[PDB]
Amino acid sequence: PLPLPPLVEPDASGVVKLKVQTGRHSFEEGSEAASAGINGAYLGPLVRLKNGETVTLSVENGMDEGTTLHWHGLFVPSILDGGPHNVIAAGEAWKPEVKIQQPASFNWFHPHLHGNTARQAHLGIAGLMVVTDGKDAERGLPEDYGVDDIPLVLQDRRVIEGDKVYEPDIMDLMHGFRGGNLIVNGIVSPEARVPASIVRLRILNGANARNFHVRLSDNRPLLVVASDGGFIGNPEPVERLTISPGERYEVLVDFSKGEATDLLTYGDDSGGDDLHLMRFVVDAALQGKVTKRPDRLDGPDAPDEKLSVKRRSFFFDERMAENMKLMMLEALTSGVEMAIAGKPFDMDRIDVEAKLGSWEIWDLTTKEMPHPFHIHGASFRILSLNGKAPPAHQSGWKDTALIDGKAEILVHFDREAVKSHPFMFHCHVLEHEDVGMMAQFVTV
Ligand SMILES: [Cu+2]
């Protein structure tokens, strides 16, 4: 059966308790591997927060090494977010108090470290974070958690038995770490039971590097209603949906005809054979609440490029000629280096000074492979992908986007970053970030 992240809401004191810890986890019957998680040995809860409330996010580090949590998609000033400038020491706690005021959205959280992100993420440390405004019923959206509103965290694994679970070699550092065992919510090939009705799937790619390109085995449409930053005004059906690390999409799927169906992904970025992710089976005993599809939601209007006060450009520089020379591991000591802002990430260097509340257009370019861009502490609208306006499903507010050739994005710097606590932007292939494909900004 598909495991469900436990639902956690603020307690009588306004607190959500999150304890990062090591353990062991079974991905498949009969085996177990070393792991780490939040409030358990792998993955974490789904924390549901109401727009307008104040919550204490009480994080305890129950490990023997430092960790952090980045509130990936949450709107906070940088002093309330986690990263390499404010590591939680082994055995210690961090209890930021957040006042939520942002669009309803499906967000998440996970470590964000200097040189160590890939390992801690792959071990399994992550959780989910929904911001709700209580209006989903009025939108016509399924909202019964675990029944017709189901989170799917897509990942991959090289190792499902044993203690040596994340052992990247030089090719993994250069190209990203991938494995052949696909998992959903921590299990190989789970099965979900669903009502014969419209079901909402809240899909996160939580892998180190792998891109998923998902369809159902009978090609039924995936009605995309939201991405990272919330709803789109004109939901779009797609037959196959690309999701890169760090991206989220909420989709509606109609199970009303009662037929079982498999979720599949292309096995690579070149249309390779589909691989099985999971199965959906319809349970006739359930009466599903939502039978009609929504056509219109409360999303943003078209982006306005005239708002931009500066144009920037960044190139995802894999430094292949220099790194292949090295080839002919631990990221920090490997010798491999990459860059997003000209030179590799440097903790003491500020790459960008952005005016607070301002808009900028950023040109993003790749060469050898695609890269998922993520910015902390800001939001963006995709203006173009390879010269073309984005499809509707990719047109709303986003914080993470797969760049493949050229993109142009419209960034809004709406949250404050002080010099002691810069925000960051980076590739979300965790190996690339760990070898330097990361940069830092402050607001001015
Ligand atoms: Cu990358």
User: How many whole angstroms does the radius of gyration measure?
Assistant: 21 Å
Helical content band: under 10%
CATH architectural type of the largest domain: Sandwich
* Ligand kinds: copper (II) ion
Q: Globular, elongated, flat, extended or rod-shaped: what is the shape? A: globular
> How many domains, as an integer?
3
- Across the major sheet, the strand order is 13-12-11-15-20-17-18
Distance between the termini: 50 Å
Structure write-up:
The chain is mainly beta. It folds into 3 domains: 1-132, Cupredoxins -  blue copper proteins (Immunoglobulin-like, Sandwich); 133-298, Sandwich (Immunoglobulin-like); 299-444, Immunoglobulin-like (Sandwich). It is built from 6 helices and 31 strands. The chain has helices at residues 117-123, 136-139, 170-175, 320-327, 331-334, 430-434; strands spanning 7-8, 15-25, 33-38, 46-50, 54-61, 70-72, 93-94, 97-99, 105-110, 127-132, 149-157, 181-184, 187-188, 191-194, 198-205, 212-216, 222-227, 230-238, 241-243, 248-254, 261-266, 274-282, 311-315, 352-354, 359-365, 371-375, 379-385, 400-403, 406-412, 423-427, 438-443. The strands form 6 sheets. Strands 13-12-11-15-20-17-18 form a 7-stranded mixed sheet, with no helix packed on it. A 5-stranded mixed sheet has the order 1-4-10-9-6, with no helix packed on it. It is globular and about 60 Å long. The chain starts with 6 loop residues before the first strand and ends with a strand. The structure holds copper (II) ion (CU).
